[PDB]
Amino acid sequence: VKKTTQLKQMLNSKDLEFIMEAHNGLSARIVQEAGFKGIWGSGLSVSAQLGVRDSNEASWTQVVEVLEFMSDASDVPILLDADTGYGNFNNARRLVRKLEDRGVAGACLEDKLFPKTNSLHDGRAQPLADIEEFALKIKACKDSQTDPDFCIVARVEAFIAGWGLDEALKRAEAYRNAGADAILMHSKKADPSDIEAFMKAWNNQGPVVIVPTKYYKTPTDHFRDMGVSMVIWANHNLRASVSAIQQTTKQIYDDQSLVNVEDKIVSVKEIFRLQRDDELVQAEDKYLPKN
Amino acid sequence: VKKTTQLKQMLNSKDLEFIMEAHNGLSARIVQEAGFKGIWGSGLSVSAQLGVRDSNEASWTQVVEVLEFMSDASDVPILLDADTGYGNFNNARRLVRKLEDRGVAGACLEDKLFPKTNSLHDGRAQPLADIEEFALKIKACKDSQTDPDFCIVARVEAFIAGWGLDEALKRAEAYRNAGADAILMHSKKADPSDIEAFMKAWNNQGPVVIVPTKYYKTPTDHFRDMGVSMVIWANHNLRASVSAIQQTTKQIYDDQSLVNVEDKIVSVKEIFRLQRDDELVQAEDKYLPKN
Amino acid sequence: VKKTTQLKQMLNSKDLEFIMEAHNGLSARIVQEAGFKGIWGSGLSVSAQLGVRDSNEASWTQVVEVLEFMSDASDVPILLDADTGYGNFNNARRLVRKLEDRGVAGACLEDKLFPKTNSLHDGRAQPLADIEEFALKIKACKDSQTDPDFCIVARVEAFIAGWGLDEALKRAEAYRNAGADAILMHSKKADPSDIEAFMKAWNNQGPVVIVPTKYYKTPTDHFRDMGVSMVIWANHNLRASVSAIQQTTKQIYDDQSLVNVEDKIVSVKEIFRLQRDDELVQAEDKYLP
Amino acid sequence: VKKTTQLKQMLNSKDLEFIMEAHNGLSARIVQEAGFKGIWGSGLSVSAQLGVRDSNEASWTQVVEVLEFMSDASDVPILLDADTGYGNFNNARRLVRKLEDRGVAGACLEDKLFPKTNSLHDGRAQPLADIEEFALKIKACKDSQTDPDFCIVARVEAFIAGWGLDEALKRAEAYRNAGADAILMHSKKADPSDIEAFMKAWNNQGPVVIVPTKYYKTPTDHFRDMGVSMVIWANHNLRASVSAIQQTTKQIYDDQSLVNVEDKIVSVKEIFRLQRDDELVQAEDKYLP
Ligand SMILES: O=C(O)C(=O)CS(=O)(=O)O
Ligand SMILES: O=C(O)C(=O)CS(=O)(=O)O
Ligand SMILES: O=C(O)C(=O)CS(=O)(=O)O
Ligand SMILES: O=C(O)C(=O)CS(=O)(=O)O
Ligand SMILES: [Mg+2]
Ligand SMILES: [Mg+2]
Ligand SMILES: [Mg+2]
Ligand SMILES: [Mg+2]
């Protein structure tokens, strides 16, 4: 069961699926250990851990390198938030090849311009890619694949860009017909209005993916009611990690002692176990001259 | 005030200094924001976030790349736990040049063999570098510097390797004479016995650095009593980050909702602020055609 | 002196300066030893040694690393041909900083869209960037540098695209007023007419850089007479390398032997010297018991 | 067929096979087109194009990326000269996996210590690894591969180091029993005596690979008669490239013109073809409105 196949099956499953954000090898392993069937390589969380902005500042090969360590450290599929493809169809298809090679299950591309701006920002230019063009990019990525099960998810930032339903629906149809394996309908509204609207008008033309970050209060079962195939928990490991580090850093700063953190944080032996140090020990005993 | 100078002054200060571990650009920014005058680029925390082991699995340029993002995102000096230098004096001095160029304040090298094993492990081969040799490596690094204030810290893993005080003291003296800017005396004992022993026998021949991880219960003021120049909080941001992600990942998994994490983790706007998104906005308004 | 200073001095000299193309650490060291005062970090050549197209396929950091090995191997400046900057102003300024830290001396940015298309191509569409946008991108780079001598060369593709003198001048004036340290007027024409027409109208507002690839018969003195501050031999070492590799590979493939190539190629000791292996020997003597 | 399979088939053929050295994407594509069935990823050449020494100065991942561009640009196999493996068995097995994923066909590891020293050097100390340790490292690689055809070539430096036939055989037998797919017996001698002495005692236990650099006058047929399965022309394209770059750079530097080099170097259109620019044109036609 290759990772691509897994991700393909989750997207194609009538049953509602869940992938969780990870932004590095360590968090990739954790998401997997918790039982999640999938991982979301958040464009924002990856750039965030690096300390840069979610606006194509890190190079795409740097994004892929980060993701390489993530693939190596996980057995479950990683869908990478690949922004706009980092350029035209050619940059797009080249990225798809690097992704397959590293074991990454799929890439998600958004109909915006390079470089992009995070979707959660209010009052900022959020210009769209010409529909017909973005579709060819979708198709060029699909055509370029070597692995049939690799997934290409198209993201309609129409609602995000302030446009209406007709626009969103138009784009979705265009990219699904272009071969996309699922359509990601985004919105920043605090309510599920836009999703409710698209889904109603979509008439199950294809698996749909959503990012409930801004309307988190919405009852999950409601997504099943609408018939969404997969939900993406987009950035909570990143956000929790900050709290923990800010709180821990503050506490250690103030007390100039480790006394007040030792019991609130994981042990050194838990780290060693997450790196699979026992496997090296096994191997060391096996490939190193006994004495 | 260059970063090297800062780190030089902290090491040389009679006053006890504190540097905190960071393992990526994001945590580097946080450690700085909390007020810390320095950052510890933990060999283990860096390899841990990548998902590999603290045994030279990631390449040194991958370690340096990680550290590059960290330097860019911080104004305070970063001392990098550089293991054994990733090879002989030549690999050592080449690393020192890359470090200067990226803005990194200094490198800490340990008298062990390549590839190394984390020091916190019990019952594992912890073979030492020939003293005279490691000293030349120290000297070759010092000689190679372009920036006079860059720091080279020598780490005596003698106590760690199970040897005694005479050995530790011998090594320390050898490397200090070789030019090192501070000696890092390590131990895994649950008590400060070894440090108390070295410091007593050292007679302030040079600034000494310590990693209190295993004897964290020891009263900090006691390090000042002994005359230690700097303490290193080696891996607590890494460990806290795991707790947070494991707990958060578990909670989201179980509830299939974001309802129970939203209030326990930092906000999306706090992330944007840690990436300094406002600076880009300023710049965007300034270098992008108004309309 | 400082590489950036070395290069700014060249762009501002009243003398026709020359910078040779290099595409990896090794060729950059050769150029250096040959006497050249500067190196042209050819995007085409750099992409070509990687076996990829001059179409922004290789990430901008991969190009940066290539140039890092190159800067490391030379004491003279390297002007990196950074295509259109690999993005918007933000991507450009991120580039300028890194390039600075890596020891590179300057960046030449061109006014086309990302991803770009090589200039010597015919029939291929060459879209031009908005003038203000590109000009604002030049300012941003100039404002972002931390070494006042690092040079930002603005490159006009108006001719390559198929437009006229009137269009080139307007773009060149705009970029120069934005803070460019020099203007590079390109042309794929058979003669120097485009450069002539421009140099004549330019009135020496700022240093002008050119690439004679397609009009290489123009006698060099003519550029001096036009006032051209710098010339770029942009891809000859790369083209030469290929010629030599194709032939040595053919000869060996056919002879199933090395006797017919060993006397037509530098020696292994020559490679060691180019790698400055002698320095390592002196160093091993100091730092190895 | 699969690159790894292509290469394993070559090491096991009863025929004397040849693999040519390449050091970047471009030369690898040239080697491919010339007809060669395999490419030798020369550590010396790879380090030399970077402008650095064959002394493990460039990280093992930087070498990997270089080879990635190389694998991407060729349909034939590439045997990477991975020096001593860049560390202990663990570092070696990490290497094998990456190399696999990048499409490389095999790795040749040598029994010296990290960081290594080029073999053609004289007087330089050449420390040998413990036999069991190195043999155990070979097993580890063989046990770690996920593509059964990926080949692990073990390289004996006993002669290069200055020891005798008796030492080479023992090391070669040990590594072969550990699972090596082939043994590479090196020698910097003026004649094939070392190879002779070894091939004779070897009794064809396994495929044997050689590098004729220093004894290039030996007629190739003699290797066939000795039973040698593969020969490596290890650095000629790199040495050729330098010769051509040194001369083209000299000529241009002196003429302050291109007329005397433009007729002695491949054309710009030749570079485009080598970059498979034609494929992009076909693609732009499909995927651009
Ligand atoms: O996590 C990301 O980077 C996303 O794709 C979703 S958003 O943050 O852009 O809304
Ligand atoms: O944090 C590290 O990697 C250290 O140098 C200290 S220890 O973890 O090795 O004890
Ligand atoms: O070498 C390059 O990429 C150049 O800048 C010159 S040209 O090939 O575009 O004419
Ligand atoms: O090209 C190399 O690095 C070789 O393996 C052959 S030798 O140069 O070491 O003889
Ligand atoms: Mg995103
Ligand atoms: Mg450490
Ligand atoms: Mg160019
Ligand atoms: Mg070699």
What is the 3-class SS of chain A, one letter each residue?
CCHHHHHHHHHHCCCCEEEEEECCHHHHHHHHHCCCCEEEECHHHHHHHHCCCCCCCCCHHHHHHHHHHHHHCCCCCEEEECCCCCCCHHHHHHHHHHHHHHCCCEEEEECECCCCCCCCCCCCCCCECCHHHHHHHHHHHHHHCCCCCCEEEEEECCCCCCCCHHHHHHHHHHHHHCCCCEEEECCCCCCCHHHHHHHHHHCCCCCEEECCCCCCCCCHHHHHHHCCCEEEECCHHHHHHHHHHHHHHHHHHHHCCCCCCCCCCCCHHHHHHHCCHHHHHHHHHHHCCCC
**What does the alpha-carbon distance between residue A173 and residue A161 come to, in Å, rounded to a whole number?**
18
Contacts of B61 in chain D (CB under 8 A): 59, 61-62
Q: D45 near D80, Cβ under 8 Å?
A: no
**What does the alpha-carbon distance between residue A263 and residue B108 come to, in Å, rounded to a whole number?**
28
**What does the alpha-carbon distance between residue D109 and residue D182 come to, in Å, rounded to a whole number?**
11
Q: CA distances (Å), D268 to each of C24, D66, D242, in order?
A: 18, 23, 19
Q: Are strands A106-110 and B78-81 parallel, antiparallel or unpaired?
A: unpaired
What method was applied to determine this entry?
A: X-ray
| Closest ligand 4 atom number to CA of residue D108 | 5
A108 lines ligand 1 (CB under 6 A): no
Can you name the residues that pair with B154 across neighbouring β-strands?
B109, B183
Q: A169 near A201, Cβ under 8 Å?
A: yes
Which 3 state secondary structure label does DSSP give C79? strand
Residue reference for tokens 């198709």: A139
Side-chain-side CA neighbours of residue C157 (13 Å): 23
What resolution in Å is listed for this PDB structure?
2.2
Residue reference for tokens 């400046």: C77
Output the CA torsion sign for A253, A257, A262, A266: positive
Q: B182 near B230, Cβ under 8 Å?
A: yes
Residue D14, both tokens: 């009863």
**What does the alpha-carbon distance between residue D156 and residue D205 come to, in Å, rounded to a whole number?**
15
**What does the alpha-carbon distance between residue D126 and residue D129 come to, in Å, rounded to a whole number?**
10
Q: D45 near D62, Cβ under 8 Å?
A: no
**What does the alpha-carbon distance between residue D97 and residue B6 come to, in Å, rounded to a whole number?**
42
* Nearest residue to B274 (alpha-carbon basis) of A51, A234, A122: A51
Q: CA distances (Å), C131 to each of A87, B159, C178, in order?
A: 21, 66, 11
* Nearest residue to B51 (alpha-carbon basis) of B213, B245, B250, B211: B245
* Chains in contact with chain D (at least 3 beta-carbon pairs closer than 8 A): A, B, C
**What does the alpha-carbon distance between residue C101 and residue B175 come to, in Å, rounded to a whole number?**
30
* Nearest residue to B233 (alpha-carbon basis) of C144, C41, A253, A184: A253
**What does the alpha-carbon distance between residue A107 and residue A64 come to, in Å, rounded to a whole number?**
11
Q: Does residue D54 carry a catalytic annotation?
A: yes
| Residues found in chain A | 291
Residues whose CB falls within 8 Å of the CB of residue C158, separated by 6 or more in sequence, listed in order: C111, C128, C164, C167, C168, C171
**What does the alpha-carbon distance between residue C127 and residue C168 come to, in Å, rounded to a whole number?**
14
Distance of CA C88 to the CA centre of its chain: 20
Q: Which residue of C has its CA nearest to A57?
A: C91
- How open is the CA angle D58-D64-D69, to the nearest 5 degrees? 115
**What does the alpha-carbon distance between residue A134 and residue A144 come to, in Å, rounded to a whole number?**
15
**What does the alpha-carbon distance between residue A121 and residue A125 come to, in Å, rounded to a whole number?**
9
**What does the alpha-carbon distance between residue A258 and residue B122 come to, in Å, rounded to a whole number?**
22
* Chains in contact with chain C (at least 3 beta-carbon pairs closer than 8 A): A, B, D
Residues in contact with ligand 4 (CB, 6 Å cut-off): D 42-45, 54, 81, 118-120, 211, 213, 234-235
| Residues found in chain D | 289
- Omega before B115 cis (within 30°)? yes
Residues whose CB falls within 8 Å of the CB of residue D286, separated by 6 or more in sequence, listed in order: A136, A140
Which 3 state secondary structure label does DSSP give B179? coil
Q: A181 near A208, Cβ under 8 Å?
A: no
Q: Which residues surround ligand 6, an ion (CB under 5 A)?
A: B 43, 81
Can you name the residues that pair with A112 across neighbouring β-strands?
A128
Q: What is the CATH number of domain B1-291?
A: 3.20.20.60
Rounded to 5 degrees, φ, ψ at C39 are -125, 140
Residue reference for tokens 């992704």: A99
Helical segments of chain B, H only: 3-12, 25-33, 43-50, 60-72, 89-102, 131-144, 165-177, 193-202, 220-226, 236-255, 268-274, 277-287
**What does the alpha-carbon distance between residue A4 and residue A147 come to, in Å, rounded to a whole number?**
8
Output the CA torsion sign for B18, B23, B25, B29: negative
Residue reference for tokens 């010396």: D44
Hey, where are the domains in chain B?
1-291
DSSP strand E in chain D: where? Answer: 17-22, 39-41, 78-81, 106-110, 151-156, 182-185, 208-210, 230-233
Residues whose CB falls within 8 Å of the CB of residue B105, separated by 6 or more in sequence, listed in order: B3, B4, B6, B7, B38, B77, B78, B79, B150, B151
Residues of A annotated in the binding site for Mg(2+), as ranges?
54
Neighbours of A139 (CB within 10 A): 20
**What does the alpha-carbon distance between residue B59 and residue B57 come to, in Å, rounded to a whole number?**
6
Interface test with D, best of C236, C267, C276 (most D CBs within 10 A): C236
**What does the alpha-carbon distance between residue A205 and residue A172 come to, in Å, rounded to a whole number?**
9
Rounded to 5 degrees, φ, ψ at B183 are -115, 130
**What does the alpha-carbon distance between residue D41 and residue D94 come to, in Å, rounded to a whole number?**
18
Q: C56 near C112, Cβ under 8 Å?
A: no
Longest dimension (CA), chain B: 73
Residue reference for tokens 């950074």: C82
Which 3 state secondary structure label does DSSP give C32? helix
**What does the alpha-carbon distance between residue C227 and residue C207 come to, in Å, rounded to a whole number?**
9
**What does the alpha-carbon distance between residue B124 and residue A28 come to, in Å, rounded to a whole number?**
28
> What is the DSSP code (8-state) at residue B226?
H
Residue reference for tokens 């099943």: A224
Neighbours of D289 (CB within 10 A): 8
Q: A113 near A129, Cβ under 8 Å?
A: yes
Q: C43 near C81, Cβ under 8 Å?
A: yes
Residues whose CB falls within 8 Å of the CB of residue D149, separated by 6 or more in sequence, listed in order: D2, D4, D5, D7, D8
* Nearest residue to A190 (alpha-carbon basis) of A158, A216, A160: A216
The answer on whether C54 is annotated among ligand-binding residues is yes
Side-chain-side CA neighbours of residue B163 (13 Å): 19
Residue whose Cα lies nearest atom 6 of ligand 4: it is D234
- How open is the CA angle C220-C221-C223, to the nearest 5 degrees? 70
Residue C75, class by beta-carbon neighbours within 10 Å (0-12 exposed, 13-18 middle, 19+ buried)? exposed
Distance of CA C69 to the CA centre of its chain: 15
Angle between helical axes of A60-72 and A89-102 (0-180°, round to 10): 20
Contact C280 B90 (CB under 8 A): yes
B38-64 in b/e form (b: 16+ CB < 10 A) is: bbbbbbbbbbbbbbbbbbbbbbbbbbb
* Nearest residue to C90 (alpha-carbon basis) of C130, C144, C132, C135: C144
Q: CA distances (Å), C211 to each of A65, A86, C115, C195, C231, in order?
A: 36, 30, 21, 10, 6
| Residues found in chain B | 291
**What does the alpha-carbon distance between residue C175 and residue C194 come to, in Å, rounded to a whole number?**
18
Rounded to 5 degrees, φ, ψ at D210 are -135, 160
* Nearest residue to D177 (alpha-carbon basis) of D126, D238, D218, D134: D134
One-letter amino acid identity for D31? V
**What does the alpha-carbon distance between residue D201 and residue C94 come to, in Å, rounded to a whole number?**
61
Q: A77 near A106, Cβ under 8 Å?
A: yes
Which of the residues D15, D54, D191, D278 is marked catalytic? D54
Residue D68, both tokens: 């990635």
Which 3 state secondary structure label does DSSP give B213? coil
D106-119 in b/e form (b: 16+ CB < 10 A) is: bbbbbbbbbbbbbb
| Cα Rg of chain C, angstroms | 20
Residue C206, both tokens: 């700022």
Residues whose CB falls within 8 Å of the CB of residue B131, separated by 6 or more in sequence, listed in order: B111, B170, B171, B174
* Nearest residue to D141 (alpha-carbon basis) of D115, D112, D110: D110
Distance of CA A285 to the CA centre of its chain: 38
Residues in contact with ligand 2 (CB, 6 Å cut-off): B 42-45, 54, 81, 118-120, 211, 213, 234-235
Q: CA distances (Å), B194 to each of B131, C109, C252, in order?
A: 20, 59, 65
CATH number for domain D1-289, candidates 2.60.40.10, 3.40.50.11600, 3.20.20.60, 3.40.50.300: 3.20.20.60
- How open is the CA angle C284-D233-D84, to the nearest 5 degrees? 40
Neighbours of C22 (CB within 10 A): 32
Q: Are strands C182-185 and C208-210 parallel, antiparallel or unpaired?
A: parallel
Q: C231 near D211, Cβ under 8 Å?
A: no
Residue C133, class by beta-carbon neighbours within 10 Å (0-12 exposed, 13-18 middle, 19+ buried)? middle
| Cα Rg of chain A, angstroms | 20
One-letter amino acid identity for C151? C
* Nearest residue to C278 (alpha-carbon basis) of D124, B88, B135, B87: D124
Output the CA torsion sign for D120, D122, D124, D128: positive
Q: D28 near D39, Cβ under 8 Å?
A: yes
Neighbours of C135 (CB within 10 A): 24
Which 3 state secondary structure label does DSSP give C20? strand
Residue C148, class by beta-carbon neighbours within 10 Å (0-12 exposed, 13-18 middle, 19+ buried)? exposed
Calculate how close chain C gets to D177, using CA atoms only, in Å.
31
Q: CA distances (Å), D178 to each of A196, C229, D118, D127, D139, in order?
A: 63, 64, 25, 21, 5
How many Å lie between the centroid of ligand 6 and the Cα of residue C206?
54
Residue reference for tokens 């090298």: B109
3-state secondary structure D244-281: HHHHHHHHHHHHCCCCCCCCCCCCHHHHHHHCCHHHHH
Residue B245, both tokens: 């992600």
* Nearest residue to C211 (alpha-carbon basis) of C165, C157, C256: C157
Side-chain-side CA neighbours of residue A12 (13 Å): 12
Residue B117, both tokens: 């094993």
Contacts of C115 in chain A (CB under 8 A): 87-88, 90-91
DSSP calls for B44-77 = HHHHHHHTS-TTT-S-HHHHHHHHHHHHHT-SS-
Q: C134 near C179, Cβ under 8 Å?
A: no
